[PDB]
């Protein structure tokens, strides 16, 4: 992993789109495995490889393959991901975000709020008041610059919970008529819904509501169109909780699914987790390997 992240970090400093391809991927028949059998054989999926590579190359050259249409107009989706930076100074925890919103022409704006805001504790996957204020102000100013108006709602989601200090700072920053909603998306709680009769698993999109603030969503499983499964061995659901906010549990799940339908790095039906968090994790993985970039580019072409 050292090669890829360092290369992307320096080219980030120089702002050049790039794509790394192994020789085994493009020519898999030549590189055998000492037994007359390819180490990685693409014989039955030779068109999926082409789909993925072509879509990635098209996106990295400045072209939109598709866009989201069914998303609430007037909201911002922010995903916060924490990565542990522990090399010299202290086991610091960097926070990297990603922003998505849609308005003024039905277009989709999918960028990443960057400028990692650190926290000098071993644990403590949270933000101090000043860094939270800076994060929210930067996101709000970006949205207002794009849309010439302030957001009607803000949809903050992360893999960790929010504390009262952070939420009070956020509410201090927020304008008079902007509401904030916090959501925590855990991934591996031990629930497994088997199907009583068939040998095929539960369908994707089934949701179980345990409370007016918590629910399970099956983002994997058996999809009718493809007549196959998006996973293996009894797919695992994800857990959604409305932490520190006031909203409905159905709109949240619909928004979560819509966010899952935005993976540009690969050509698939959908992925289990929302992409706003995966791309933030990629941004963090790229940034933590470099040495103190002042103002990184916010475009996704340079990172992925």
């Amino acid at each position: 992993a050292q090669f890829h992240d360092q290369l992307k970090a320096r080219l980030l400093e120089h702002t050049i789109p790039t794509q790394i391809l192994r020789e085994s991927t493009l020519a898999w028949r030549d590189f055998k495995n000492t037994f007359g059998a390819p180490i990685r054989d693409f014989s039955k999926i030779e068109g999926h490889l082409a789909w993925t590579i072509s879509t990635a190359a098209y996106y990295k050259a400045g072209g939109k393959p598709w866009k989201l249409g069914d998303i609430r107009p007037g909201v911002c989706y922010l995903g916060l991901v924490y990565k542990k930076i522990e090399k010299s100074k202290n086991p610091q925890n960097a926070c990297c975000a990603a922003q998505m919103f849609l308005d003024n022409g039905d277009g989709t704006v999918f960028k990443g709020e960057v400028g990692p805001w650190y926290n000098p504790e071993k644990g403590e996957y949270h933000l101090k008041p000043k860094e939270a204020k800076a994060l929210l102000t930067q996101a709000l100013e970006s949205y207002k610059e794009q849309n010439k108006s302030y957001p009607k709602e803000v949809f903050i989601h992360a893999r960790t919970r929010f504390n009262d200090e952070e939420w009070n700072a956020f509410n201090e920053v927020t304008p008079k008529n902007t509401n904030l909603v916090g959501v925590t998306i855990t991934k591996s709680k031990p629930l497994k819904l088997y199907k009583t009769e068939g040998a095929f698993p539960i369908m994707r999109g089934n949701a179980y509501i345990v409370d007016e603030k918590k629910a399970f969503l099956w983002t994997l499983g058996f999809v009718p169109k493809l007549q196959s499964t998006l996973s293996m061995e009894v797919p695992n659901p994800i857990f959604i909780e409305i932490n520190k906010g006031e909203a409905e549990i159905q709109q949240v799940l619909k928004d979560i699914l819509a966010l899952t339908k935005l993976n540009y790095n690969a050509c698939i039906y959908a992925d289990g987790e929302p992409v706003t968090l995966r791309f933030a994790n990629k941004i963090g993985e790229i940034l933590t390997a470099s040495t103190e970039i002042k103002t990184p580019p916010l475009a996704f072409k340079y990172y992925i």
């Binding site: 031990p190 629930l191 497994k192 819904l193 088997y194 199907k195 009583t196 009769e197 539960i202 369908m203 999109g205 009718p224 169109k225 007549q227």
Partner: protein, 197 residues
């Protein structure tokens, strides 16, 4: 979709029209169905796969009822009351509450040995205690919200204690059965042997 049915020109409004307004794929599928119905002539798997793709462009789910099993095995009953015994000076400080027959914790400032029942004899046989000082709490209020919280133990801790007791009780029970143990990273696994069954 902006053309009203009352404004279509004459000699077309009386015909059978195909709706391309909502989605073009559905209209094209309807067109192909009409063509195949009225024997419309047509002429290397680039068209068979294409036709299958057009047909399966929307394999919508059906309103069929299904029943799913889970792995959440419920608990049908609990012991009536949760007990809190003193056992001061009858329990050595350098003696863990584990390695004991029944699930017991030494939590809280005093009133240790959180077990549901008595009879820790032959392991600490002081066998001389005054039952008046023992504190007893109803498990009904502990599990189900209620006013079980006091300055002694608040409600949140009073449930994390019961979960601990259950997780311990399962471990001690699953040893008079006929299985052996495997040690995972943070838990224990219970598997049946080859000779049995």
């Amino acid at each position: 979709e902006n053309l009203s049915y009352d404004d279509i020109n004459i000699e077309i409004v009386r015909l059978n029209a195909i709706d391309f307004k909502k989605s073009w794929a559905k209209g094209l599928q309807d067109l192909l169905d009409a063509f195949e119905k009225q024997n419309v002539p047509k002429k290397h798997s680039k068209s068979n796969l294409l036709y299958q793709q057009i047909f399966l462009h929307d394999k919508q789910a059906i309103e069929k009822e299904e029943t799913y099993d889970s792995n959440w095995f419920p608990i049908i009953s609990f012991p009536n009351e949760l007990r809190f015994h003193r056992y001061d000076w009858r329990l050595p400080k350098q003696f863990d509450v584990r390695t004991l027959a029944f699930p017991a914790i030494r939590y809280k400032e005093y009133l240790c040995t959180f077990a549901w029942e008595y009879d820790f004899i032959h392991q600490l046989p002081k066998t001389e205690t005054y039952n008046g000082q023992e504190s007893i709490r109803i498990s009904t209020s502990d599990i189900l919200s209620g006013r079980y919280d006091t300055d002694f133990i608040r409600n949140y801790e009073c449930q994390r204690l019961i979960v601990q007791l259950i997780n311990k009780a399962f471990e001690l029970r699953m040893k008079d059965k006929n299985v052996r143990e495997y040690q995972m990273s943070k838990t224990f696994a219970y598997w049946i042997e080859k000779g049995k069954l």
